Design a protein around this ligand. Sequence first.
Ligand SMILES: [Cl-]
Ligand SMILES: [Cl-]
Ligand SMILES: [Cl-]
Ligand SMILES: [Cl-]
Ligand SMILES: [Cl-]
Ligand SMILES: [Cl-]
Ligand SMILES: [Cl-]
Ligand SMILES: [Cl-]
Ligand SMILES: [Cl-]
Ligand SMILES: [Cl-]
Lengths: 273, 272
Amino acid sequence: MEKVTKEDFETIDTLGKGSFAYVVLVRRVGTNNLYAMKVVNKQGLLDHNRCRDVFIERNVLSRINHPFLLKLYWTFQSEHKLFFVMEYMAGGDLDKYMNSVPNKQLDLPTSKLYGAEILMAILTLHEQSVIYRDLKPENILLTGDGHCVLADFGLSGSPFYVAPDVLKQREYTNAVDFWSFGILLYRMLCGRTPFSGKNMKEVFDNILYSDLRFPSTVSIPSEAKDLISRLLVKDAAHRIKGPEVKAHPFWTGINFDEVMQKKVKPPRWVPAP
Amino acid sequence: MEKVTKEDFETIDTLGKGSFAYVVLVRRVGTNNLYAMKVVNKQGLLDHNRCRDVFIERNVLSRINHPFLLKLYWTFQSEHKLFFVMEYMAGGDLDKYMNSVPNKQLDLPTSKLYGAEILMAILTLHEQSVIYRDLKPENILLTGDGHCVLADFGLSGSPFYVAPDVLKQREYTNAVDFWSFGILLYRMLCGRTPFSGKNMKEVFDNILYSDLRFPSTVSIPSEAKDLISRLLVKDAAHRIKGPEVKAHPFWTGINFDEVMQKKVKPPRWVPA
Ligand SMILES: [Cl-]
Ligand SMILES: [Cl-]
Ligand SMILES: [Cl-]
Ligand SMILES: [Cl-]
Ligand SMILES: [Cl-]
Ligand SMILES: [Cl-]
Ligand SMILES: [Cl-]
Ligand SMILES: [Cl-]
Ligand SMILES: [Cl-]
Ligand SMILES: [Cl-]
């Protein structure tokens, strides 16, 4: 790619702020092309021990160009900052989309496709020893044609998706992602998360101690219940792991190769540029 | 893919009409998804040419996944017809696009990107032993975000892109695709094809015997002129081949790995 510097991008708007990074909507000078540019303080990266994360993002994930991870176009530096010019997703996120559909529920074909796309993303991250840690609808972005893409993992509701492991020990492993994935699958199919409460204390107690229950009013295939139940085993040591999740009978009727090729479209996508 | 038949697609409009096949815009019933479906009357398979083309589409091209080859979702048959459900390209084709831009000329960055994407498609076809043989702007479709995609399952302008190899022998090698590629690069940069005439006989005589001539009113890099000239060598044996085309200095400002990942966007794309 061209040897760009910060001078080659015109800031149009702000897309968010963080501890030591911010994201701006930019237009590449001389073109009509828009991008989401993440600007990260170099000293901040060093103080937060994020150099490995940056190396993986820039030198490993960028080569994979996974369809359901955010696309990276350019990385470059200034004196004090590193810049990551990434795809601008104006189609919103999955939290907003699900809150706008009737009953808050996605039908089975859509839930299964989005579950497969998200699973492929999570499996790719784990292969690179990256734990997403914050899987939730707000961090799943939608393309213009209705496919799911994981939000920038460096950047990042949450109380409902936290695993027992994190509440008890703050210990992050691949299993916490599969717990959150089970919460997400349940949410897409049922219209709500499985564990709630009148305050955070009750929510955490239910996450730790309450048996999983499915709504009597929602028709869920037995295979989906089986997979969600195994993803939401309380003890991480006995939780279903990646290979068994990918081989689970719930994925009957969806071909992961065709999903990776974008040949399985969302049946009811509502484009809205 | 889920099993389908003709009954699962509702015709919205007609996109193209051909001798023994037509393309329609369709919607998968029960969804909001749109596709382009080519319908081929099996009666037209008596022609060895049309029979071979459909054979290649059903058995070879159907198995290729490439960003710049048109995507095929389903292929199936009825008692007397054949069906190809492919991606509907919202941007239309490169012939209409180039006839809309001022002076009918694409700028150098756009010409180089589109040339790179088309070259990647051609090289992949040759690796699969497929000769496209009909490379021209009408067969280059445009995605909603401005990328070029070779039409693979469409209906069979054309006289301006035919190589001397075809005119002399009626015989085809990989070289005919690189001749058409030469004509296309010249068209994008210069606003017209190199060889024209007042009738078809004049056009063919110029292709066979007239030395390539570049316009005096259009300035193009010497590297672009060199590559087009190597592509438009009339003797097939001495025409530039695939690997030398890919390594040519004209592609200096392009990285083909990034183009394959759709990380090089067209700078002026007008999604209308
Ligand atoms: Cl511009
Ligand atoms: Cl390290
Ligand atoms: Cl510094
Ligand atoms: Cl970061
Ligand atoms: Cl794509
Ligand atoms: Cl069939
Ligand atoms: Cl052949
Ligand atoms: Cl050859
Ligand atoms: Cl060759
Ligand atoms: Cl390559």
